[PDB]
Design a binder for this molecule. Structure first.
Ligand SMILES: O=C(O)[C@H](NC1CC1)c1c(F)cccc1F
Lengths: 237, 300
């Protein structure tokens, strides 16, 4: 059923699973019209589908053309997400298909379940974790590929870079969620933490800087400090 | 006008006949029910004074044979039986009528309630939902489960209602997932009406039968079925106009007849609010919406 703090190590066992986040699929800017009314202008979006054990990210880029002439776009976005996730699963060899798909927003449950009726042995589940995956578009290289796309496209990343050579997937996921929570909390400050130092670079085939083990501890501490502060600033404590 | 005689009444029992009911005392000289209107199905049902567990009863049509009730002290219930000897039967009935040992089906001549609750209900369709083919009448009780319920356990004693499931491949065309889930017109009109039921009268008959089993026996699987069949119509953008108008009448009379003290377990708040206020047909059920709002405004 629902996923929470009690069954948290289940994410890192050997049953293939995917998180799906739809929060960046349908994205708009709201602006005034010449007549003084308000209109939206869609921009490119993405489905964030992540294997938390391996770090494999299936980034489906949602080009604005998919909304042309469509109504009720925020509802359509959930069904388009489910259609794309279902298509991804069918394209995977059987032994690579997930045994569970965990959606970060409960509104995705019915669209995904309907689209996956052919896969009765794939459990569709919600979660009670407050995951920071909406901040994925704060990762510069992910933002860049989404905004440059001129057509629908699927782009594959490893969101853990090479971390699994030195740490477990539990630790890698905690690191990822901390980085992304910080980015979602105060993007500018988070990005300053990560890039302040010109001598630590991002390899061309990576998303995050090449921190040593010792530097990651420092970075992680800084992200905690950021989040705990913003938490006080907002509630005053 | 036809007659269901009783051999006797050895245990104290509340007997129902359609929407009427009366109390019989242990060993009271009660020998049955007379003046039963021909042309409609009927249900004769029982609640023992000593056991409010298990309401049970029999659906029947007096045109299909001569039926009587006889208490069975082994199985502990009043059993319907068919008498094949027609002269024996007339002779028994005439004697008990002459002794005035029968209650009269108490229909008021202005009253179309029973017809309105059973307009589309036929014995031949009841007998396919309730499989017991050596008998012309059909036994139902509180505890019988539906075919759908057993899929989620004795099959002989089940209610074989048409399975409706909104998240099923039958309900959802490949490539039309969003369309068919948010507009059930395909599932209603092609799958169910054209494919399974053949016409809306058979659809309405099963819906009316489901409600009546829910109301008279507290059969929970029947209540589920009634609500599912309503929800399927209400959630379809495209419904024949005559079906909407008839649905409104059907439901009006069901809501009018439901005991007020059972409304909290026989009416599903989610379905009714969706149907009257959110669905495609939210403005098509004027009679039903008006009675629901004046009788059960709390639910909503
Ligand atoms: O309002 C919060 O509790 C806080 N957001 C504020 C900007 C700090 C927060 C977290 F720090 C972590 C997870 C979810 C949250 F909503």
């Amino acid at each position: 059923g629902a996923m929470n703090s009690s069954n948290y190590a289940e994410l890192f066992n050997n049953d293939i699973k995917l998180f799906v986040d739809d929060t960046n699929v349908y994205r708009v800017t709201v602006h005034k019209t010449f007549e003084g009314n308000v209109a939206t202008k869609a921009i490119n979006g993405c489905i964030f589908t992540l294997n938390p054990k391996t770090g494999h990210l299936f980034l489906k880029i949602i080009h604005t053309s998919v909304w042309a002439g469509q109504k009720r776009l925020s509802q359509l976005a959930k069904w388009k997400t489910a259609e794309e996730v279902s298509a991804l699963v069918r394209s995977l060899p059987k032994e690579e298909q997930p045994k569970q798909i965990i959606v970060t927003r409960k509104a995705m449950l019915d669209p995904l379940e309907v689209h996956m009726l052919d896969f009765p042995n794939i459990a569709i589940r919600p979660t009670e974790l407050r995951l920071p995956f909406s901040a994925a578009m704060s990762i510069d290289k992910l933002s860049d590929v989404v905004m440059k796309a001129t057509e629908p496209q699927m782009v594959l990343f490893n969101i853990y870079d090479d971390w699994l050579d030195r740490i477990s997937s539990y630790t890698a996921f905690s690191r990822l969620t901390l980085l992304l929570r910080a980015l979602k909390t105060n993007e500018e400050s988070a990005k300053m933490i990560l890039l302040s130092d010109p001598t630590i670079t991002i390899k061309s085939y990576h998303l995050w800087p090449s921190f040593t083990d010792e530097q990651w501890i420092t970075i992680e501490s800084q992200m905690r400090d950021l989040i705990l502060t913003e938490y006080g600033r907002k509630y005053n404590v | 006008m036809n007659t269901v005689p009783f051999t006797s009444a050895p245990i104290e029992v509340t007997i129902g006949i359609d929407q009427y009911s009366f109390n019989v005392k242990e060993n009271q000289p009660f020998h049955g029910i007379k003046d039963i209107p021909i042309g409609h199905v009927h249900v004769i049902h029982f609640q023992h004074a000593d056991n409010s567990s298990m309401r049970y009863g029999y659906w029947f049509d007096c045109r299909m044979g001569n039926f009587y009730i006889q208490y069975d002290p082994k199985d502990g219930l009043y059993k319907m039986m068919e008498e094949r000897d027609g002269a024996k039967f007339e002779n028994i009935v005439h004697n008990f009528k002459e002794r005035q040992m029968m209650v009269s089906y108490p229909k008021i001549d202005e009253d179309d309630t029973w017809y309105n609750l059973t307009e589309f209900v036929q014995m031949d369709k009841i007998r396919k939902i309730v499989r017991k083919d050596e008998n012309q009448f059909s036994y139902v009780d509180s505890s019988m489960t539906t075919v759908q319920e057993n899929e989620l356990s004795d099959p002989a004693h089940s209610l074989n209602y048409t399975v409706i499931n909104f998240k099923s491949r039958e309900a959802i065309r490949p490539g039309h997932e969003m369309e068919d889930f948010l507009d059930k017109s395909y599932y209603l009109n092609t799958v169910m009406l054209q494919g399974i039921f053949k016409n809306s009268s058979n659809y309405f008959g099963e819906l009316q039968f489901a409600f009546l089993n829910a109301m008279f026996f507290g059969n929970y699987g029947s209540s589920l079925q009634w609500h599912a069949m309503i929800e399927l119509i209400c959630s379809s953008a495209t419904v024949p106009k005559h079906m909407l108008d008839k649905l409104d009448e059907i439901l009006y009379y069901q809501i009018k007849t439901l005991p007020e003290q059972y409304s909290d377990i026989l009416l599903n708040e989610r379905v009714w609010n969706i149907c009257l206020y959110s669905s495609f047909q939210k403005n098509s059920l004027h009679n039903t919406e008006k009675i629901m709002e004046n009788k059960y405004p709390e639910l909503l």
